[PDB]
Nucleic acid binder design. Structure first.
Lengths: 138, 189, 62, 314, 132, 65
RNA sequence: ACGAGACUCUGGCAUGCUAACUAGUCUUAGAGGGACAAGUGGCGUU
């Protein structure tokens, strides 16, 4: 009796406690579009206008969001909303409606379910970096 | 309600031909409400070509060692003055949008010859994508030199970027340099 | 100088004292379909489409 | 001598079907096991407008199950992976009920006893054991055991008396009563392997399945030869009619049904999708699930498509 | 490159000739059966062997391949080797015979035979290819 | 596998003339149990179970005295 | 028969698993799984 999946990306994470209640949406724990970096405000507005209010009229979600890096915590928020919504629809109503809505959301873009595998590689041998080498004298 | 962005729509912009979508291709998941899709464009060849034209134009301007790849710059620039000009225009930028660059474009470049000799270059062409994007890169250099040591700055040339973007007539500057080199190389055809 | 859309059939490879030009072979689509060859710079994918803006440019081979 | 017709289509799925099981007493639970940490729920509708609607995506398995069995009442799901683990699912709470990790060897099967008295599992120590729910030793037989791994132990599918049927991939079959448990006769030298065995509800037959296809039939008292019915490739689904004496399986793409008096196929009429690519290979067939008594038949393939036909029997 | 070394090639070949019965085409099944019947001391090597055996079954399903001598294909081939036609090809009623071979047959004490139809020999003595 | 299959010993033997270095390397044989060889086999050796001879009549017919 | 590969370490992955009163299954580290040129096209005594 534990249906929770949260959302993690790169180094950041966001636990999304989803449960039935009055059915109102609370995001970021702060006003909708006031975020201080201001870099990626418009990107957050895709689902709330693409889906509608009736779709999310019964969802009570509470998010613990942590992580430094816009590419990390942002896009983690979208992976989290998509995954939590998909799990909730799969569990509570049916699977065909889940296929339709999840197909719509993950057909908007692909990067939702895939995180970047690139990571800093080890500093290598006899050189300042992983590939550069100390200047060779003749 | 499948309208692209918040002000355009894909239900009416048709060419009734399925072969001229080499420049604007909005029919599938690749469509972006904001070009900040992250990712890499150097992991393997043809993946820089598989960049959307918009994102290539907005990113490729990253040069020098201080603004190198910082995507925040590209996204802030493409948001700023875009938010302004959309409401302040009222009309369609489509005319200039299309009719400066996306057929300013050249139609050939030049390549090396034989085993020696750097006094002339044999004329070849490319499938228009690589030629158009080399012209776009030189136009990024030109927009720099129109900002670098000049008056008109970066993040205020959104008209010129839309010009560089859209579709099909000729008014450019770096591209007419490219066309002069076109003719020079074509003098061997 | 007609813009002719041709399909790539076989890509030869690179030429130059260090390698600076790429050979491909193209077949026309609606010009009494036949095959010619031409050199080209830059990325040209497997079986992509070339635009022969001119119907006479031939590349010397070797 | 049975007529059928494919009357519809079913599109949209994620996990192709592995094993089939249903209960006559409880028709409110129908399941299909998958191989991507997945199980699908079903309901019987038999409608052209709606032949199927997905309701429950039963998840919770950490590894691909080998065989899934049900008790007399369709209320307990006992599943065993190819690891030695065990998962029990009960509908009174709708979650994990009893999880067991107590077999440290690569056990290939699990089984629920009908009489709920003893438990068996396949270990690699060349010896079978009987276990209780109290965690004590009950009966271990070290002599005259299976030559290799023991696949499973089966009891009657229908309500009746329990008779232990031990089967293995070592081509050895044992039939035991709950009192004696002695090896009466033994025979060796099989040409083909044994996938699994089945228990007949009429209590006079014991078929076989495998690559060789020889359905070797023994009696119940001893190991007298009765007949080696024909087969094709590796057989993976055997069952009699719950109320009639027939035999059916799909050793490969087509359907192989037999009457114990004719022993041969009568008329193979089928329906297959066409492909404009001559090198697109078709999927494979493993099981045929009757609706409840043979008035309709279902099957699943590796083309993410479930194929259902209406059968008129006669 | 993805060239499969001699170890995986030999293992897959011996695996397919010994237990062709159990092995199939779907990678999951090949991997499972390969683990079951082959003591492979690695997992990556096990996957490589299973992939090559899958390729070899794609090869065998569309003809015979010289590396393996499976019982079923060899049985069918030998069955084809005991093929015998209803009428022997040497049961020719009329055999076309040139003048020189019938002269030989007459010198062979076989001249009474009437099956040999004496044919018209070719009048051209051009039988060697031109030089150049 | 050179770690757990080959043991090498390097020693110095002092002769009145000089010092002679002897390097002796032995690869143990594979034998499970008994700790006389490495437990794991060489990781490029694929083992196959051997079937036994099978020359059988066409049909198994029960025989009784 | 060495060498190459295989092999060890290393990062990359679970609406899975073995559980922590310093995190609330995200961090830590597992007897394990997962990729194999595998699926489909095009070149290859195919």
């Amino acid at each position: 009796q534990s249906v929770q999946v949260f959302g993690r990306k790169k180094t950041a994470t966001a636990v999304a406690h989803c449960k039935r209640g009055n059915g109102l949406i609370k995001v970021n724990g702060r006003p909708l579009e006031m975020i201080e970096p201001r870099t990626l405000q418009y990107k957050l507005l895709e689902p709330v206008l693409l889906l509608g209010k009736e779709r999310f009229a019964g969802v009570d979600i509470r998010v613990r969001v942590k992580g430094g890096g816009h590419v990390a915590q942002i896009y983690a928020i979208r992976q989290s909303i998509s995954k939590a919504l998909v799990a909730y629809y799969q569990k509570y109503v049916d699977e065909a409606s889940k296929k339709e809505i999840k197909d719509i959301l993950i057909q908007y873009d692909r990067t939702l379910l895939v995180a970047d595998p690139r990571r800093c590689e080890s500093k290598k041998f006899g050189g300042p970096g992983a590939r550069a080498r100390y200047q060779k004298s003749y | 309600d499948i309208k692209l962005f918040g002000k355009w729509s894909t239900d009416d912009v048709q060419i009734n031909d399925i072969s001229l979508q080499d420049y604007i291709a909005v029919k599938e998941k690749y469509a972006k409400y904001l070009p900040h899709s992250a990712g890499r464009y150097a992991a393997k060849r043809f993946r820089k070509a598989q960049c959307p034209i918009v994102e290539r134009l907005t990113n490729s301007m990253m040069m020098h060692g201080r603004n190198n790849g910082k995507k925040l710059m590209t996204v802030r620039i493409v948001k700023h003055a875009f938010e302004i000009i959309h409401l302040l225009t009222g009309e369609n930028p489509l005319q200039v949008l299309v009719n400066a660059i996306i057929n300013s474009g050249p139609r050939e470049d030049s390549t090396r010859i034989g085993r020696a000799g750097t006094v002339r270059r044999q004329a070849v062409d490319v499938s228009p994508l690589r030629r158009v994007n080399q012209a776009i890169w030189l136009l990024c250099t030109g927009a720099r030199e129109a900002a670098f040591r000049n008056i008109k700055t970066i993040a205020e040339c959104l008209a010129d970027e839309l010009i560089n973007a859209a579709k099909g007539s000729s008014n450019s500057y770096a591209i007419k340099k490219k066309d002069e080199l076109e003719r020079v190389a074509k003098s061997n055809r | 100088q007609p813009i002719k859309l041709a399909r790539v059939t076989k890509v030869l490879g690179r030429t130059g004292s260090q390698g600076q030009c790429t050979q491909v072979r193209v077949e026309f689509m609606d010009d009494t379909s036949r095959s010619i060859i031409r050199n080209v710079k830059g990325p040209v994918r497997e079986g992509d489409v070339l635009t022969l803006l001119e119907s006479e440019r031939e590349a010397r081979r070797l | 001598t049975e007529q059928m017709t494919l009357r519809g289509t079913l599109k949209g799925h994620n996990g192709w079907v592995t094993q089939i099981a249903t209960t006559p007493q409880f028709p409110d639970m129908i399941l299909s096991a998958s191989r991507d940490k997945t199980i699908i729920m079903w309901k019987l509708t038999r409608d052209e407008t709606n032949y199927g609607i997905p309701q429950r995506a039963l998840r919770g398995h950490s590894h691909f199950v080998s065989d899934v069995v049900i008790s007399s009442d369709g209320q307990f799901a006992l599943s065993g992976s190819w690891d030695g683990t065990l998962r029990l699912w009960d509908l009174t709470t709708g979650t994990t009920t009893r999880r067991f990790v107590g077999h440290t060897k690569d056990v290939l099967s699990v089984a629920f006893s009908s009489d709920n008295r003893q438990i068996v599992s396949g270990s690699r120590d060349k010896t079978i054991k009987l276990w209780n729910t109290l965690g004590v030793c009950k009966y271990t037989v070290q002599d005259e055991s299976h030559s290799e791994w023991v696949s499973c132990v089966r009891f009657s599918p229908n309500s009746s008396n329990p008779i232990i049927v031990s089967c293995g991939w070592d081509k050895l079959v044992k039939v035991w009563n709950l009192a004696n448990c002695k090896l009466k006769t033994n025979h060796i030298g099989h040409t083909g392997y044994l996938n699994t065995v089945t228990v007949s509800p009429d209590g006079s037959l014991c078929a076989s399945g495998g690559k060789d296809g020889q359905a070797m039939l023994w009696d119940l008292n001893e190991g007298k030869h009765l007949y080696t019915l024909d087969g094709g490739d590796i057989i993976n689904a055997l069952c009699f009619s719950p109320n009639r004496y027939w035999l059916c399986a799909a050793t490969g793409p087509s359907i192989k049904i037999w009457d114990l008096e004719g022993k041969i196929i009568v008329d193979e009429l089928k329906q297959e999708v066409i492909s404009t690519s001559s090198k697109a290979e078709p999927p494979q067939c493993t099981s045929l699930a009757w609706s409840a008594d043979g008035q309709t038949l279902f099957a699943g393939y590796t083309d993410n498509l479930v194929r259902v036909w209406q059968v008129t029997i006669g | 490159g993805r060239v499969r070394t001699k170890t995986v090639k030999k293992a897959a070949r011996v695996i397919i000739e010994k237990y062709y019965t159990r092995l199939g085409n779907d990678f999951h099944t090949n991997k499972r059966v390969c683990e079951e019947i082959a003591i492979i001391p690695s997992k990556k090597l096990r996957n490589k062997i299973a992939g090559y055996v899958t390729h070899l079954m794609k090869r065998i399903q569309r003809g015979p391949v010289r590396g393996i001598s499976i019982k079923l294909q060899e049985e069918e081939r030998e069955r084809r080797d005991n093929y015998v036609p209803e009428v022997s090809a040497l049961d020719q009623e009329i055999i076309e015979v040139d003048p020189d071979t019938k002269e030989m047959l007459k010198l062979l004490d076989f001249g009474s035979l009437s099956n040999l139809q004496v044919t018209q020999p070719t009048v051209g003595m051009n039988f060697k290819t031109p030089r150049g | 596998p050179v770690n757990y299959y080959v043991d090498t010993a390097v020693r110095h033997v002092l002769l009145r003339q000089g010092v002679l270095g002897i390097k002796v390397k032995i690869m143990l044989p594979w034998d499970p149990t008994g700790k006389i060889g490495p437990k794991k086999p060489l990781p490029d050796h694929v083992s196959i179970v051997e079937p036994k001879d099978e020359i059988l009549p066409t049909t198994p017919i029960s025989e009784q005295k």
